[PDB]
């Protein structure tokens, strides 16, 4: 990671605030994601043939939103421990790779997330850029690991 101290601090500081509100706004993020990206929704076989109102309230969606938040937290906490960061992200990668999810889906989700998070918290463009750069490190690890793995 070539993330600077100020970049990592902006992300960590932003995330510290965001994570408390995620418990309530996270499901709405995933609905937004699913509405933009029906192919993303389609990986959640539990949601087959379900109205988006029902998806939004589903414990399965809420669990994934918690899984998302916790994953992101684990990465942000490890930005100064690159070997640990890579192990954590590779474990995420394997699980999603096994479901036929390409890195491109993470890139979609990350791009939407940064905007969603900025709109919520109204943090500055410095902080938005720092998020984008941080999530590009994460996507870089995901993508490279998916290329290592046998389908």
Residue 73 partner contact from a copy of itself, ligand HEM, none using kind-dependent CB cut-offs of 5 to 8 Å: a copy of itself
In this structure, the dihedral spanned by the alpha carbons of residues 95, 100, 105 and 107, taken in order and rounded to 10 degrees, is: 60
Which positions from 51 to 90 touch ligand HEM by CB under 6 A, shown as an x/- string?
---------x---x--xx--xx------------------
CA distance linking residue 104 with residue 115, whole number of Å: 17
Contact between 43 and ligand HEM (CB under 6 A)? Answer: yes
Residues lying near a copy of itself in the complex (CB under 8 A): 23, 59-60, 62-63, 66-67, 70-71, 73-74, 77-78, 81, 83-84, 86-88, 91
The answer for residues whose C-beta is within 8 angstroms of residue 42's C-beta and 6 or more apart is none
CB neighbourhood size of 99 (10 A): 10
Provide the sign of the torsion angle of the four alpha carbons 37, 43, 48, 54, taken in this order: negative
Residue 59 partner contact from ligand HEM, a copy of itself, none using kind-dependent CB cut-offs of 5 to 8 Å: a copy of itself
Strand segments, DSSP code E, in the chain are none
Residue 15 partner contact from a copy of itself, ligand HEM, none using kind-dependent CB cut-offs of 5 to 8 Å: none
CA distance linking residue 16 with residue 39, whole number of Å: 31
Residues that bind ligand HEM (CB under 6 A): 40, 43-44, 46, 60, 64, 67-68, 71-72, 91-92, 95-96, 99, 101, 105-106, 109
């Amino acid at each position: 990671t070539k993330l600077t101290k100020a970049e990592k601090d902006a992300v960590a500081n932003s995330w510290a605030a965001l994570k408390q509100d995620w418990k309530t706004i996270g499901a709405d993020f995933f609905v937004k994601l699913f509405e933009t990206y029906p192919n993303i929704k389609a990986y959640f076989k539990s949601f087959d043939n379900m109205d988006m109102s029902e998806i939004k309230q589903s414990p399965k969606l809420r669990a994934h939103s918690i899984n998302f938040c916790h994953g992101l937290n684990s990465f942000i906490q490890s930005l100064d421990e690159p070997d640990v960061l890579v192990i954590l992200v590779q474990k995420l990668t394997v699980n999603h790779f096994r479901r036929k999810i390409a890195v491109d889906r993470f890139q979609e989700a990350f791009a939407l997330y940064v905007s969603y998070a900025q709109d919520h918290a109204k943090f500055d463009d410095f902080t938005a850029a720092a998020w984008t750069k941080t999530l590009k490190v994460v996507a870089d690890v995901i993508g490279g690991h998916m290329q290592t793995l046998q389908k």
